[PDB]
């Protein structure tokens, strides 16, 4: 009768570095990366935990986690222990670092056991999705599984880049293959394979034993995906949970939404798609809200309207404390505090907070880093060979622009 | 050596009805009226107190305070008594008989705090002011009351309560709306208009307060009764707004607005859409706190040969979706939905308003939550607009849902 | 859902906190009964509110009326952590929805339909805010939707003799209420075992749609006293489907609670009794149960302090419960419950004393079997509990021999 | 008119080892050490900054700071940047090389705030002080630094960093722990001992840090390198603690404790059990903020000839259950449980400690979380108590769970 989330603790793995995001994660961890206009990536997993009724959350951080920890301190500060709530920030140590994803839990057993939760919900903190974990908790205790694993249903070509669960008639996992050339199809549903989301449900006592076992192991790489889960799919019982079964779909979302934003192109695409008339992600959904750190800001402002300059945004998303002064914006996403100045133009641009666009500058197909000041008259998106020399340019043509790249510029 | 603000308590009078705002205040008090895009009028006096260092604030409410009180509970909820902070919401034993009575019935709330000074404030004006200047002038002068006063040219002061002042800024008389306002000595052509801001010693204020409660013939007002008495038999001095006004570098003069009429209200909000506004709402040095929620960003959608969602010379808040609507010189509060083929011009649009397709509205103030009917035209036909809505002599229409429900289209 | 999502996600608890608490006398002269202190730190209303919170209900509305300044200020300060953008809400609904009052209990929801409906909750959990108890409302929500009832009613299973002071539900064997009698002299008994009747706790669960219509019908009736208990519920036991939910099925009992705990604290004797019992070795109510915690308004205070110890005076508490910011200086406490900020001075003695916050006990004072009102300053040497006739004429004394002491009483004293 | 605190930023040095506190600081920094019953040591410097009107606070942490950082996250969480206030936890070439480097490495977070004044604080002492006095003295004297100094008898100053002064409190020389300290002119027999409290102009300090970091010969330390440097070239002036100490009307002298030893730590806490304590913790005029949870009250149960649960000449916090336990001259923090027939005397008992039945503990400091085994005896046998636990030369025993875990005889 009692919802299982009451006795569950969410453990969010947020030590990911996000290498292929390049300079975008040079001084911040991937979960701390901005998304959607006002939030960070980590906020989705945490909001999923909150909205699912999970009252205890732990966040494990590792490398370049200053801005992530500061975000968590100021954004996720409303939990009170005397109301049986808890939000623990568990930075590395805890010697220096976590030797792995599983080690990130093992090192903090004495944080977990005082709470004595019945269930452990292990979550990847670097994905953008909405999901009700209550469904996954029910399945785990119903099935009697040692571990329940959240899985995406993806076409078999696409599953080649994922960790794939080999499933039987009863969605029981018989084998795990990382990056299969030919991914095992679902029994009776070939053409689709199950891709692991990096979401794991355990009974706490089982998980504590499995990580103590893993720690005393000289060969282990101390990871769930590589050491913990492969051991269980063999000796124990591992079952699969479908994302479609628990995904919280807005009535304005055509399919279960899940983004890894693992590359610059992917990050740019996921953000720009929010400027659609009908976007895949419905950020205006009130049923399953995403909490984050936000300050009271002034409203967006658009000025100038003459023969040579007009401050205006079309097909765009614009946040607070933005002043669009004689600047033309099209198909762009502007985070809080952007200053765009006269005669400048933005097209296909994802613009992170507190960026300044100088007069006469024209930028197309770009991701601009937090706080960057774009010099007056700079042009991006016109000369591919020039843009590649100056900035990080994808083969799709998206340029990532940071202040360090701008500093090296006089030509 | 220690700031006097440590020993001050701000008492904000927020029972003001704002009758001339008409339907705008039929279901709310004037301090609860939205302004600027995100705040309410009451937030300016309260933020002035906060930024001046005053840790104790009382707010007297009266007329339709349900929305005002709720705003205060949720927006101004960060004061903690054990840190010597307090925020008391004092709702009206029944009716307060006046602004003095509002302070009289709550003496047992003030005395436990035992503040040295009381800063009495009008909660229905828009301005920024450092009250530390008033407090020190009040203490250094030895005055029974120090009164905040605007320096306005002798002609605009005919609509104010004017303080007649001598060479030492001592108030020698007070005249309500004089036909020929008394001038400043050595600076005729300028008169001192009362701001509704009064600074007392708490001991003195409590006596004058109780004395007024002892007068059966008193109208129980600071303006009608308390202040004129002190002007006569005591010592009243004036404090210049220009001295303590907190001006931004991007503000060309001391900013103070009464927004007493629908025209004045409309004007003050639309002027924020200027390239260089009189009020700098982007000044981080003297911030205005209010009740704000986490909202989605503003969204502009549609860009074809027939419809384009875009704002021009405008101010747009969060949770706003401008879908195929053309906005010009407009101020949009939070949560507005403007739909395809609609157009807004010179429009003050309060929160949660929905604009139906093909609607064209010009020179309007749209009340909170109003759903504009598809195809509705305002600003095109003065006789017809005045028939349907509340239309000022200068052509600004106030639009409420009750007026819309009278329609048939 | 899928028999998956908990029903509390789509529920709104509506707490009726307008109760005068008349029999409590001077204790409720300038405060409503739900604002009456209890336990040493909290107020009565904090239990129904914490029950709602711990049960997973995130939308809360509180209807006030009778001198609710202190009550509203308590909710303002203590229950301020709900955020609307997280789909949580806390609404303080003071009487004005017009002019006068709410005409009763049902009107309290009728006047605020405009606040309820924008939330559009699927279920309404109507709560009485003047009781002390711990309960998981999810159970009652599950039963309500599984039974198909028009209203589910929380009921205590009490001895039939004791039920004569309760609104009594008559049921069949499947706990379907067939009649409701207010204070029956000879209450009807449960099928299967007579001697116990089902006592309505004043806790009702509705489908919001059914409730909204059932209340505008009540407002459309001039014969109606506009009450849930007297008008709404008795009308439903006839025309529709009323089912009983038993407290023992959903009560949250600690490992150190031998029975389901529920107190009305309607009289001075029972209010004194309920508080003093907390000084027991094994209290009926476990206030140290972290599994179902009671949130309240609390400030950071200094610890409790006890001083001197000699010939004649020793500041010490025995068989007592002492809150923060208390200074027990040369004061002997015994079987007493002290709220925050109490100052008991030398040569004073307290026994069987419920001492509300900020009370000062002057030197040499000796008080026994008393309830001391908030902030009351007890004069030095004042003896209470020695002479019944003198105590009776001087204070509010019960037939059991308990004196309620207010500052009003103290100041108009002779010798 | 404007108080100087509005433009000041407190910078708290909280990397203090507290190494002589031994096992008390094995897994926590000294500022994170509990004091007074509900607070930690660093809460005093932070409350001082708060009550002085300083809205920007930076805390520099170094070693074993997980417990410290967590305390600051949860306790000092009410600062909102948009209200022009901030609370920065500055953790972090590699670590901080010194107290002066702790500021140089965080210039990137200081410069955006652009404060006009910096108030460098030691976060490992226990004192109440109004920093506004010190701020004012700084700008009036035109000093390059102003330093908080205790006026102590010369023999007591032998363990301090000591300042010379001339006849106008201008600092002439600084000596690190002098056996024969220089005396103040006019009132000899007393010297000026450093509080580790510095006040700079922010732009003077930033160039001081950049200069220091550019000196290879530097130990990167404030009092070792920065301060005595400007003592010679620049202008260093001493500020008397007694001038700005916030003394309660129940404090017979300025209160300041370093609690560096187990002896000094035990003494300071147990002094709070006095009938007339040197430190007035009940002073609501200058309150100390900290992390605190809603707890149940303190409970005293059982009343026999064999056992009686009660506290005498003691201080007891919330969530404490004194069951058949006899307490005398003891200070209990939150959550302490003491079981039947046990006896505490002269005991400082940290949070969530459990005293098992029949235990007898005298002259002790029990670490946080420690479970004392049933029947344990401390206070009867010096040579045994020294063998089992950490025993001071005065006879105080520090008891950790370690010593209890290895406890056999």
Copy the structure tokens of residue A117. Answer: 């939760």
Copy the structure tokens of residue D363. Answer: 């002259």
The answer on B378 and B236 residing in a single domain is no
The answer on D189 and D53 residing in a single domain is yes
The answer on C313 and C174 residing in a single domain is no
Look at the block and give the residue holding tokens 């300053």: C377
The answer on C241 and C96 residing in a single domain is yes
Report the distance separating Cα D122 and Cα D126, nearest Å.
10
* Apex D371 CA angle, D370 and D374, nearest 5: 145
Q: Cβ(C115)–Cβ(C200) under 8 Å?
A: no
Copy the structure tokens of residue A224. Answer: 């769930």
Look at the block and give the residue holding tokens 């000093």: D143
Report the distance separating Cα B1 and Cα A405, nearest Å.
51
Name chain B contacts of C67, Cβ cutoff 8 Å. Answer: none
Which of A277, A291, A302 faces B302 most closely, judged by CB atoms?
A277
Final residue of a domain: which of A233, A251, A284? A284
The percent of chain A in helix, strand and coil, each rounded to the nearest 5, is 25, 30, 45
Q: Do C323 and D294 touch (CB under 8 A)?
A: no
Tell whether B78 lies on the interface with A, counting CB pairs under 8 A.
no
Cβ neighbors of C21 (< 8 A, separation 6 or more) are C27, C28, C32, C33, C36, C130, C266
Cis peptide before A94 (omega within 30 of 0): yes
Tell whether C83 lies on the interface with A, counting CB pairs under 8 A.
yes
Which of A3, A78, A83 faces C295 most closely, judged by CB atoms?
A83
The answer on A111 and A176 residing in a single domain is yes
Report the distance separating Cα C99 and Cα C106, nearest Å.
17
Look at the block and give the residue holding tokens 């708490």: B202
Report the distance separating Cα D134 and Cα D198, nearest Å.
9
How many beta-carbon pairs below 8 A join chains C and D?
97
The answer on C13 and C142 residing in a single domain is yes
- In angstroms, the separation between the Cα of residue B229 and the nearest Cα of chain A is 43
Name chain D contacts of C287, Cβ cutoff 8 Å. Answer: 296
Nearest CA in chain A to D75: A77
Q: Cβ(B227)–Cβ(B195) under 8 Å?
A: no
Burial status of residue B206 (CB atoms within 10 A of its CB: 0-12, 13-18, 19 or more): middle
C120 CB-side CA count, 13 A = 3
State how far the alpha carbon of B2 is from the alpha carbons of A73, A378, B136, C278, D379, in Å. Answer: 33, 52, 11, 47, 50
Final residue of a domain: which of A268, A284, A300? A284
Task: Select from D374, D399, D372, D375 the least CA-distant residue to D388.
Answer: D399
Q: Cβ(C266)–Cβ(C21) under 8 Å?
A: yes
State how far the alpha carbon of B73 is from the alpha carbons of A394, B90, C60, in Å. Answer: 51, 12, 15
Tell whether C115 lies on the interface with B, counting CB pairs under 8 A.
no
Q: Cβ(D254)–Cβ(D161) under 8 Å?
A: no
Residue D8 sits in a domain whose CATH number is 3.90.550.10
The answer on C173 and C54 residing in a single domain is yes
Tell whether D81 lies on the interface with B, counting CB pairs under 8 A.
no
3-state secondary structure of A353: coil
Report the distance separating Cα C86 and Cα A288, nearest Å.
8
Tell whether A38 lies on the interface with B, counting CB pairs under 8 A.
yes
Q: Cβ(A32)–Cβ(A68) under 8 Å?
A: yes
Q: Cβ(D268)–Cβ(D35) under 8 Å?
A: yes
Report the distance separating Cα D250 and Cα C302, nearest Å.
16
Q: Is A178 within any annotated ligand binding site?
A: yes
Report the distance separating Cα C238 and Cα C23, nearest Å.
32
Report the distance separating Cα D207 and Cα D196, nearest Å.
20
Nearest CA in chain A to B299: A317
Cβ neighbors of C19 (< 8 A, separation 6 or more) are C32, C33, C34, C66, C128, C129, C130
* Discontinuities after residues in chain B (C–N over 2.5 A): 92
Which H or E run includes C327?
strand C327-329
Task: Select from C144, C129, C141 the least CA-distant residue to C55.
Answer: C141
Task: Select from D290, D343, D351, D341 the least CA-distant residue to D318.
Answer: D351
Copy the structure tokens of residue C13. Answer: 């608890």
DSSP states of C96-133: ----S--SSSSHHHHTTHHHHTTT--SEEEEEESS-EE
C104 CB-side CA count, 13 A = 15
Q: Do A315 and B296 touch (CB under 8 A)?
A: no
3-state secondary structure of D41: coil
Q: Do C316 and D303 touch (CB under 8 A)?
A: no
What φ, ψ does residue C244 adopt, rounded to 5°?
A: -95, 135
Q: Cβ(B379)–Cβ(B396) under 8 Å?
A: no
Q: What is the resolution of this structure in A?
A: 1.8
The answer on B172 and B25 residing in a single domain is yes
Tally of domains within chain C? 2
Q: Do B82 and D287 touch (CB under 8 A)?
A: yes
Which H or E run includes C397?
strand C396-397
Which H or E run includes B388?
helix B382-388
The answer on B358 and B211 residing in a single domain is no
SS3 track for D328-387: ECCEECCCCEECCCCEEEEEEECCCCEECCCCEEEEEEECCCCEECCCCEECCCHHHHHH
Name chain C contacts of A138, Cβ cutoff 8 Å. Answer: 4
Which H or E run includes C369?
strand C366-372
SS3 track for B287-326: CCCCCCCCCCCEEEECECCCCECEEECEEECCCCEEECCE
DSSP bridge partners of B337: B321, B354
Strands (E), D94-208: 117-122, 126-127, 145-153, 161-163, 174-176, 190-201
Look at the block and give the residue holding tokens 């503040």: B115
The answer on D344 and D225 residing in a single domain is no
Report the distance separating Cα D117 and Cα D114, nearest Å.
9
The answer on A95 and A60 residing in a single domain is yes
Report the distance separating Cα C18 and Cα C61, nearest Å.
12
The answer on A303 and A263 residing in a single domain is no
Name chain B contacts of A339, Cβ cutoff 8 Å. Answer: none
What φ, ψ does residue D198 adopt, rounded to 5°?
A: -120, 145
A8 CB-side CA count, 13 A = 29
Q: Do C303 and D289 touch (CB under 8 A)?
A: no
Q: Do C81 and A80 touch (CB under 8 A)?
A: yes
Instruction: Give the distance between the most distant pair of CA atoms in chain B.
Output: 73
DSSP states of A44-59: HHHHHHHHTT--EEEE
Report the distance separating Cα B46 and Cα B59, nearest Å.
9
Which of C300, C306, C309 faces D289 most closely, judged by CB atoms?
C300
SS3 track for B234-248: CCEEEEEHHHHECCC
Subunits touching C (CB < 8 Å, at least 3 pairs)? A, B, D
Final residue of a domain: which of A236, A253, A284? A284
Residue A339 sits in a domain whose CATH number is 2.160.10.10
State which residues form the domain around D343.
283-409
Virtual torsion, Cα B283, B287, B291, B296, nearest 10 deg: 30
Q: What is the CA radius of gyration of chain D?
A: 23
- In angstroms, the separation between the Cα of residue B209 and the nearest Cα of chain D is 28
Sign of the CA dihedral A197, A201, A204, A206? negative
Nearest CA in chain B to D47: B83
Name chain D contacts of C324, Cβ cutoff 8 Å. Answer: 297, 317-318
Instruction: Find residues 289-328 of chain C whose CB sits inside 8 Å of chain D.
Output: 295-296, 298, 300, 302-309, 314-325, 327
């Amino acid at each position: 009768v009692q919802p299982l989330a009451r006795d569950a603790m969410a453990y969010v793995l947020a030590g990911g570095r996000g290498s292929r995001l390049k300079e975008l994660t040079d001084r911040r961890a991937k979960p701390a990366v901005y998304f959607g206009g006002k939030a960070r990536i980590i906020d989705f997993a945490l909001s999923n935990a909150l909205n699912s009724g999970i009252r205890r959350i732990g966040v494990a951080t590792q490398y370049k986690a200053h801005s992530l920890i500061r975000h968590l301190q100021r954004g996720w500060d409303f939990f009170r222990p005397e109301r049986n709530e808890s939000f623990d920030i568990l930075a590395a140590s805890q010697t220096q670092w976590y030797e792995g994803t599983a080690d990130a839990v093992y090192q903090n057993i004495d944080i977990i056991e005082p709470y004595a939760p019945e269930y452990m919900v292990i979550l990847a903190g670097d994905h953008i999705y909405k999901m009700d974990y209550e469904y996954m908790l029910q399945q785990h205790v119903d099935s009697g599984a040692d571990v329940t694993i959240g899985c995406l249903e993806v076409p078999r070509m696409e599953a080649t880049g994922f960790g794939v669960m080999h499933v039987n008639e009863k969605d029981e996992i018989i084998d795990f293959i990382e990056k299969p050339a030919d991914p095992p199809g679902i029994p009776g549903n070939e053409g689709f394979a199950l891709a692991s989301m990096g979401i794991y449900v355990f009974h706490t006592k089982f998980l504590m034993e499995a990580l103590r076992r893993d720690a005393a192991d000289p060969t282990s790489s101390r990871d769930f995906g590589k050491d913990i889960i492969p051991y269980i799919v063999e000796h124990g019982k591992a079952v699969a949970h479908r994302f479609a079964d628990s995904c919280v779909r807005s009535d304005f979302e055509h399919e279960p939404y899940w983004r890894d934003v693992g590359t610059i192109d992917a990050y740019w695409q996921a953000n720009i798609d929010l400027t659609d008339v009908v976007p895949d992600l419905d950020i205006y959904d009130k049923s399953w809200p995403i909490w984050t750190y936000a300050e009271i800001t002034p409203p967006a402002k658009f000025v100038h309207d003459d023969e040579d300059r007009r401050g205006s945004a079309v097909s765009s998303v614009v946040s607070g404390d933005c002043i669009i002064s004689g600047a033309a914006l099209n198909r762009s996403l502007l985070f809080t505090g952007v200053r765009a100045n006269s005669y400048s133009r933005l097209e296909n641009a994802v613009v992170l907070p507190s960026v300044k666009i100088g007069r006469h500058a024209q930028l197309s197909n770009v991701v601009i880093d937090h706080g960057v000041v774009i010099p007056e008259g700079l042009i991006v998106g016109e000369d591919p060979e020039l843009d590649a020399k100056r900035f990080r340019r994808t083969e799709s043509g998206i340029c990532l622009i940071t202040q360090s790249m701008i500093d090296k510029l006089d030509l």
